[PDB]
């Protein structure tokens, strides 16, 4: 349809208004002192949330160009918590500061392309310095320590996450379920996980977690490919139980009528080898087959699908692992070992018990967050929390080389942006003296920093204030990307009113 | 519907606003330094694109007269990337410069027709001079190099393009498909291709590749225009497992075949059959290759291993017809060559090439599906840039060839000052593509960069990605001659029409 | 006061509006087919005029920027006829040059390169205008030009030819309404100098813009001018008008008494340095007066004032007619001056003393025009004045073809103009198209829509062949009596290209704000 | 004394900026303001010629050494000392000192007091 087009600074200033509205709403919740935000509902009392992710999901602007920039930062900064599990709000605060000062220098006559080059070279050095000051996490004792800190000081949960990664490995599949009793226990079952998720967001059974869970579900494995009407006869045939259909190609009927079904993807000759393994696991049968005309739990994520507690014959399924094991000697061969590790590795299940359901769902939420944080701690390590690690990592900027003065400006844009998260931590405490608090932390060194929880200076590592290195480096990398994309945006196209 | 009519200068000034909005939006993406363009969507994040074709397709204006001038340049410039595969934004930048300077002189009193004549005489000589700078591409030695450049410096892709063009020839049918593994392969199979296309866009199976893919399909060949005998033979083929292809003079069959393809009834594709008695002879070649028979039952239908329906093209792959019967058809029309008039010579020789060479299938693969189809489409872009490069040759990229081709303007002849002004309109317009590439870098010194390139000669130019003057051919910066000359011919064509437009008729809001 | 400023294309476009308003109003009167222009008056019936000069004097605009461009081309074109209709031709030419000039500036032409190509084009057109010009010399040829400017009157043609024979070609000739009905010629003692009146309100006749004083007294003062009351009030009760010759608040006091009827005109002293005081003595001897200087006081005598019969003062020169000084003392100064010619060892002294000698010894030729009726007397007098002015200009630079044909023929010199680039060639072609404008306007004032063919038939013709708007026929304009002085034609083009080039190079226009 | 006319002397004198000391980046920015402003008089003189290309002329003058410059009257590149284009040293240095003085007061001005109309 007809379009309106904005160019040059008129587009970038309009985009900046949206970035500011997104950031200014979410950043008040940043630190441990993060202040409440009220979200209106259609009827009844409004929702009060200190969660910066919950606030960002509610941000929509009436102006199209303002909404574009607001969705740019929102989509990029959301990817920080998709992998590292934390840092969405931090990435948004950084993105606002980087784009503000960057655009401010564009008005002064700085080339936007050289600012991006200088910003990129500055991030490479800060991310590297974040690794130099990062503490590696290896061994079951300190893995339990990180799991306990992310559990809000729960030694039972820290030992549970450490024991799960001990049996199934650091890269193993670990899932969190609800226990049938008061006691919390760990159970290692059989299963596998692949990167093919749901085909539509409407299959999601849980609004906030964006996951589709099917309990006591039957698996349908075919190897032959969607919208063909022949699927209507097969769908209701065995439906009486949720169903998992696996193919390469019932959206409304699940969200409107009564049906429990999930259909994910299943490339080339490699896809035919994967579906034969799920048959020996899920306990079912897989071109030499019919036409379109069983596990305890099936969880469907956006980027992942995990089959938990599939029922095979343990004597027959053990032979399938030995068939692929024999194919390794006569064999690149790296993909054959991947399929072996999925079948023989299993899935760790965390059964979370408690007194009452309100406590059991409360305790389960901490185990999932502590698990996600511990997974990121074993990979890239841990760094000092409270926004201090971004300030300490500024020392790496000395190694950043600037080919001209505009590039040196971009380095200083990142230099001033690294201080912004801590500035917002202290600002959420309600004090106007926060400029002094930033000066003490910056003039100090090491793990010395400000803890906004007790409002006292201390050693944050010993105090239990820590962030995964993956969280911090991803927040800066994501923010610098989205802000540099907007700095280089010369046109904004949108539909007419 | 009642109409609003604009005349003379009032109409051309309004049309220029639409041409400006089109060009000013698309030209920011030109060159390696091309910047981002945000395209809004209903829900979610917008679309960031540095591609000029994506931005151009989204341009529509509220004012009908402004929208007309926008669609004018947009459609004419779109004919560049069709026969060429690149240079759509270049044609738009040239059209904006020719029309702006031309209209500027029209207000100065110059006759519009003498400007158009001067424009065409200048473009005629610039294309000729562009042919001298052209570097011909022939043989597997330099074809793999050209294919490697359009492959984003991948030598393995250039070897597949050079070897595929070696088996079936430069004009032979080459198709790129997704491989079943990481290792890329090449194989030549049976098949042919037709110059016709689908009747309705709804037959497309895969919207990503835009081509309708029917695997292990059936083919119906019928002479007259086609619901009388269709349904009995269609319903007899409705239970197959194999999709059906409809080949006739035309396809009532228009409404019923589209609604069944959109639903889950059956997969049916209709392609027109090329005219006169030559059409009835081509139906026998498709029937013998696929084993079927023409209709002038299920045993009469032909079977292939796959069918890909392009927009203007139709490709049948691996027909099931007996090879002993096909060779009897080959020597039938091959012996008919010795029996012949100057009328049909290469007409029957082209049919023999379809029943002999076949179709080569390029199979591209990678470690993950994300890179697999990303490199697969990269090969399709590399294959299209290579086939066009073989035809008209290769010229220096970065807009330098348009500047170097200005030497041919001395050969242009002007009958008066108005025509000479038109020649000078082209002279100033050829510098615009390079001036815009340097402007996309963001420097205010771009006026000096253009002076160095013009003061130099030959291969010397400016590389905007490294921001350093260097040899552009040795640095891998090249453009096909067909890409460059098409962008100049199409731009000068649309601007000449807009200069000669005395009225713009549009409906009332 | 606070100012508003317009820049470049915005200022040059507003200036063009004022230039067009002046041009379109005056150009309807151009040529013998010129049409009527009604000019309103405070009370009674308006003024109907076919004269372009009368219309141009009334052109004033509300918009200050538009008014500037109007007054710009108005003053520059006034120096062309400073008569002969050339002031309107210069305005028409100035419009065409400025219009096409601005049109190419928008097209991307450099304004200064257009000006260069314009100036080179004008030099070659004026040069070619000299070759086609036919000079006038001798009493016989002058008598023919005077008869033409008198509308086929051999009497005025002979009188002007005889007037230029008695006083010379460079002599001073004046026209005065005769006290008797017999037209006669009388040479009298007098002189003319290059100083005009010090204010337009001293002029007694608004039509000719010439201040004329009959039987007036001359006050000659050395220094600037309050303390003149004893001498000034002496002339007020003496009945004669007073002429004040001095070096220079008191100037406004004489303006009030002039408009109230209580005959005073002020003129600056001629020349400067010692030549000024030397010429002041020549005026006192011619008029029988005394120069106030260095043992004289301006407050202290009626005997020191010079006397003359008629004093005509325009905005340029002042002519003293019938000096009342004694004949012996006038020629005594002649011998005193001539004695210094042989005693001068410098070339500058000898050449400048001859100019001083030619004024006193030459005199002033007076043309007294008679007629049957007093109404016909002033009508015939104005005919002689215009005939004398046109004939005097025709002798200097020659004569060319009228009807705007000479400008068309002079276009053949444009091939001799060198253009350094395309923009300079454009300025040459601007003059090429502008030279057809005066004839195009003459044919347009006839009212015909066929004037596009008339211009082509004249351009494709040769020599003096052209179109006559009076009889609406093609003929030879030299034989038909249609001729313009070469000085008039070349001045119209030079002045038009001058003011049009200034406007093309104007990047800013400053004007006062609303009061 | 006398210096090069045509605004070239201010460009040739930019070599002294290497001797300027900056205590921080803000002071270094103020040094660069003069660096770009020294080219402004010559850039205006060339722009008053009406030429469409002003960048080439400024480039050829900045890269050349000595008194070599561009003559705007004849529109030709020539040595300005020999051609007769010359400015007094007091004229050139006073224009720079006065301009920087008034521009420094306006940059440091935090308030403007004016009467009510
Ligand atoms: Ca409500
Ligand atoms: Mg008249």
From Swiss-Prot, chain A:
GO biological process terms on file: protein refolding
The entry's keywords: ATP-binding, Chaperone, Cytoplasm, Isomerase, Nucleotide-binding
GO cellular component, one term: cytoplasm
Lineage: Bacteria, Pseudomonadati, Chlorobiota, Chlorobiia, Chlorobiales
Gene Ontology MF terms: ATP binding; ATP-dependent protein folding chaperone; isomerase activity; unfolded protein binding
Keyword Cytoplasm: yes
Keyword field contains Cytoplasm: yes
Gene3D superfamilies: GroEL (3.50.7.10), GroEL-like equatorial domain (1.10.560.10), TCP-1-like chaperonin intermediate domain (3.30.260.10)
Its job: Together with its co-chaperonin GroES, plays an essential role in assisting protein folding. The GroEL-GroES system forms a nano-cage that allows encapsulation of the non-native substrate proteins and provides a physical environment optimized to promote and accelerate protein folding.
Protein name: Chaperonin GroEL
Enzyme Commission number(s) from the entry: 5.6.1.7
Reactions catalysed: ATP + H2O + a folded polypeptide = ADP + phosphate + an unfolded polypeptide
Location relative to the cell: Cytoplasm
Family of this protein: Belongs to the chaperonin (HSP60) family.
HAMAP family for the chain: CH60
Swiss-Prot record, chain C:
Gene Ontology cellular-component terms listed: cytoplasm
Reaction catalysed by this enzyme: ATP + H2O + a folded polypeptide = ADP + phosphate + an unfolded polypeptide
GO molecular function: ATP binding; ATP-dependent protein folding chaperone; isomerase activity; unfolded protein binding
Broad class of the protein's primary localization: cytoplasm
Location in or out of the cell: Cytoplasm
Annotated residues for binding of ATP: 29-32, 50, 85-89, 403, 484
Highest taxon listed in the record's lineage: Bacteria
Chain coiled-coil ranges: none
Keywords: ATP-binding, Chaperone, Cytoplasm, Isomerase, Nucleotide-binding
Enzyme Commission number(s) from the entry: 5.6.1.7
Swiss-Prot/TrEMBL GO biological process terms: protein refolding
Subunit structure: Forms a cylinder of 14 subunits composed of two heptameric rings stacked back-to-back. Interacts with the co-chaperonin GroES.
Function: Together with its co-chaperonin GroES, plays an essential role in assisting protein folding. The GroEL-GroES system forms a nano-cage that allows encapsulation of the non-native substrate proteins and provides a physical environment optimized to promote and accelerate protein folding.
Annotated family: Belongs to the chaperonin (HSP60) family.
Protein name: Chaperonin GroEL
Organism the protein comes from: Chlorobaculum tepidum (strain ATCC 49652 / DSM 12025 / NBRC 103806 / TLS)
């Amino acid at each position: 349809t007809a379009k309106d087009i904005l160019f040059d600074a008129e587009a970038r200033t309009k985009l900046k208004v949206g970035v500011d509205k997104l950031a200014n709403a979410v950043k008040v919740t940043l630190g441990p002192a993060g202040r409440n935000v009220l979200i209106d509902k259609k009827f009844g009392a409004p929702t009060s949330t200190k969660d910066g992710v919950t606030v960002a999901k509610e941000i929509e602007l009436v102006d199209p160009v303002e909404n574009m920039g607001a969705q740019m930062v929102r989509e990029v900064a959301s990817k920080t918590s998709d992998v590292a599990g934390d840092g969405t709000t931090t990435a948004t605060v950084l993105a606002q500061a980087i784009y503000r000062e960057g655009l401010k220098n564009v008005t002064a006559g700085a080339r936007p392309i050289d600012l991006k080059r200088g910003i990129d070279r500055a991030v490479k050095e800060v991310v590297a310095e974040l690794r130099n000051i990062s503490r590696s996490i290896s061994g079951k004792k300190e893995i339990a320590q990180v799991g306990t800190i992310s559990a809000n000081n729960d030694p039972e949960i820290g030992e549970l996450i450490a024991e799960a990664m001990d049996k199934v490995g650091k890269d193993g599949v670990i899932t969190v379920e609800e226990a049938k009793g008061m006691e919390t226990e760990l159970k290692v079952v059989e299963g596998m996980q692949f990167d093919r998720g749901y085909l539509s967001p409407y299959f999601v059974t849980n609004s906030e977690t964006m996951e589709a869970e099917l309990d006591e579900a039957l698996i349908l494995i075919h190897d032959k490919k969607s919208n063909m009407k022949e699927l209507l006869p097969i769908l209701e045939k065995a439906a009486q139980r949720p169903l998992l259909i696996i193919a390469e190609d019932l959206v409304v009927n699940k969200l409107r009528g009564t049906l429990k079904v999930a259909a994910v993807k299943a490339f080339g000759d490699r896809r035919k080898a994967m579906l034969e393994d799920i048959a020996i696991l899920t306990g079912g049968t897989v071109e030499k087959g019919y036409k379109l005309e069983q596990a305890a739990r099936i969880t469907i994520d956006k980027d992942n699908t995990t089959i938990v507690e599939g029922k095979g014959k343990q004597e027959e399924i053990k032979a399938r692992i030995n068939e692929i094991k024999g194919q390794i000697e006569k064999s690149d061969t790296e993909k054959l070992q991947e399929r072996l590790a999925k079948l023989s590795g299993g899935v760790a299940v965390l059964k979370i018990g408690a007194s009452t359901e309100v406590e059991m769902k409360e305790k389960k939420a901490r185990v999932e967050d502590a698990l996600h944080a511990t997974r990121a701690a074993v990979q890239e390590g841990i760094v000092v929390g409270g926004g201090v690690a971004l300030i300490r990592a500024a020392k790496g900027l000395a190694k950043a080389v600037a080919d001209n003065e505009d590039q040196k400006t971009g380095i200083e844009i990142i230099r001033r942006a690294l201080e912004e998260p801590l500035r917002q931590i202290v600002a959420n405490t309600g004090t106007t003296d926060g400029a002094v608090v930033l000066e003490k932390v910056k003039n100090a060194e090491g793990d010395y920093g400000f803890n906004a929880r007790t409002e006292q200076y201390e050693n944050l590592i010993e105090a239990g204030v820590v962030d995964p290195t993956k969280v911090t480096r991803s927040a800066l990398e994501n923010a610098a990307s989205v802000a540099s994309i907007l700095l280089t945006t010369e046109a904004a196209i949108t539909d007419v009113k």
